[PDB]
Amino acid sequence: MDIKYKLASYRICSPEETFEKIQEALKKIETVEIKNIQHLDKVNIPVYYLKRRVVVDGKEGIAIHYGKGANDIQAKVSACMEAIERFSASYDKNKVKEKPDNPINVEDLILPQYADKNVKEWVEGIDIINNETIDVPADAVFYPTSGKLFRGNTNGLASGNNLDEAILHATLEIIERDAWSLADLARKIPTKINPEDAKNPLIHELIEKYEKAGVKIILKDLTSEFEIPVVAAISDDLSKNPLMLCVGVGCHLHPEIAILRALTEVAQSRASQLHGKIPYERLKRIHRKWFEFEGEINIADMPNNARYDLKKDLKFIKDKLSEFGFDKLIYVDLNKVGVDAVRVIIPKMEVYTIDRDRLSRRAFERVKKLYY
Numbered sequence: 001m002d003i004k005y006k007l008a009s010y011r012i013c014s015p016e017e018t019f020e021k022i023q024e025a026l027k028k029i030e031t032v033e034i035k036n037i038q039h040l041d042k043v044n045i046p047v048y049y050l051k052r053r054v055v056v057d058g059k060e061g062i063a064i065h066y067g068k069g070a071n072d073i074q075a076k077v078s079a080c081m082e083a084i085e086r087f088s089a090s091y092d093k094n095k096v097k098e099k100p101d102n103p104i105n106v107e108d109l110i111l112p113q114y115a116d117k118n119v120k121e122w123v124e125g126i127d128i129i130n131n132e133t134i135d136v137p138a139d140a141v142f143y144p145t146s147g148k149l150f151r152g153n154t155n156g157l158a159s160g161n162n163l164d165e166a167i168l169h170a171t172l173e174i175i176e177r178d179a180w181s182l183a184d185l186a187r188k189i190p191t192k193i194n195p196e197d198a199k200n201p202l203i204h205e206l207i208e209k210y211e212k213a214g215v216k217i218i219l220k221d222l223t224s225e226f227e228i229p230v231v232a233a234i235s236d237d238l239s240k241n242p243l244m245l246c247v248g249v250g251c252h253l254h255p256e257i258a259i260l261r262a263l264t265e266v267a268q269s270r271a272s273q274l275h276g277k278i279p280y281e282r283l284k285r286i287h288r289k290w291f292e293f294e295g296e297i298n299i300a301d302m303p304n305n306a307r308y309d310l311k312k313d314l315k316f317i318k319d320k321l322s323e324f325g326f327d328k329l330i331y332v333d334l335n336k337v338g339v340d341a342v343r344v345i346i347p348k349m350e351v352y353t354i355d356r357d358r359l360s361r362r363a364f365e366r367v368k369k370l371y372y
């Protein structure tokens with residue numbers, strides 16, 4: 001049991017501690033400014049940004065990274081670790097191989113129609129389900145990319161206090177996007193979550209902050225086959241302020257953490273929007289799918305498989321993925337500035353919600369089993 005589940009984080013140490021440990025990497029990534037932007041939105045949910053110096057081609061400028069959380073420290077750490085994760089993903093001429101000994105079938109990654117399957121640059125990764133090395137396309141690992149195999153994305157990029165922690169987060173993200181992808185294909189999302197029985201009072205606190213600012217919040221269950229809670233927080237802003245509909249999605253072994261991460265996601269999208277009208281018929285479509293519901297469950301009804309131990313958590317996931325024919329769980333260590341940072345790749349997991357050009361022929365069948 002190496003996980004401190006205090007308040008709203010599920011990490012090996014407190015966010016305060018993490019913030020302390022990362023100061024040097026913060027200087028290495030060239031951070032200019034770390035600003036709280038909680039009071040940009042009427043909801044008063046902690047959201048931060050980090051700006052950092054970045055040179056593209058020859059032109060220097062600024063890159064921004066947001067962070068979210070149920071308290072200030074979490075959100076500040078979140079923006080920092082978000083920034084480190086991104087910096088660490090750049091492209092590393094020393095991690096690339098040209099004649100791979102063990103190349104993955106690129107087809108398994110789910111390829112767009114325009115995919116250049118003639119992959120020149122590979123990267124050695126570790127399949128932790130099969131305890132083997134496996135070579136994966138650089139396009140699947142780094143960000144940003146040329147986009148030859150597929151359009152570059154950040155799905156599966158995570159940083160963390162140690163490697164396992166980074167791996168767990170990235171795995172939960174992959175699961176989240178896969179489940180959301182299936183949700184995107186469903187005609188209706190029928191099951192509402194009633195959060196009243198939450199042991200963690202931060203859930204009630206976050207709903208209230210939404211209600212008091214005139215934002216209705218509805219929680220929907222998007223959990224897939226793996227019994228790893230995936231939750232959508234659907235927000236409708238009925239105030240004078242210019243935002244309306246949001247939707248943020250959270251995933252975790254603990255259903256309550258999934259819920260919190262969904263709530264804080266909405267918070268982050270709102271603030272990043274604010275740092276800057278749906279036609280009837282579309283609104284009607286959105287109402288029927290995202291707002292209406294058939295059934296309602298309690299948090300108590302949802303699976304909870306968190307064992308508050310990284311090894312036990314990963315074991316559970318590895319086994320669950322494996323059980324359901326998702327037979328590889330691949331990571332690539334992307335540490336650059338002395339903080340843990342990974343790419344996780346789980347072949348066959350959908351990414352459609354992030355890249356509409358990528359959808360496998362298995363998605364339909366999975367949608368029918370899970371929904372109708």
Ligand SMILES: Nc1ncnc2c1ncn2[C@@H]1O[C@H](COP(=O)(O)OP(=O)(O)OP(=O)(O)O)[C@@H](O)[C@H]1O
Nearest residue numbers: 011015018068077078081082085158159160161169
């Ligand atoms: N307390 C923490 N300790 C170590 N790493 C953290 C901590 N909080 C966040 N991170 C890392 O920073 C990155 C951003 O985390 P966060 O949960 O805010 O965003 P996310 O889950 O990527 O969702 P989104 O970016 O869509 O808002 C992730 O790589 C995460 O693992």
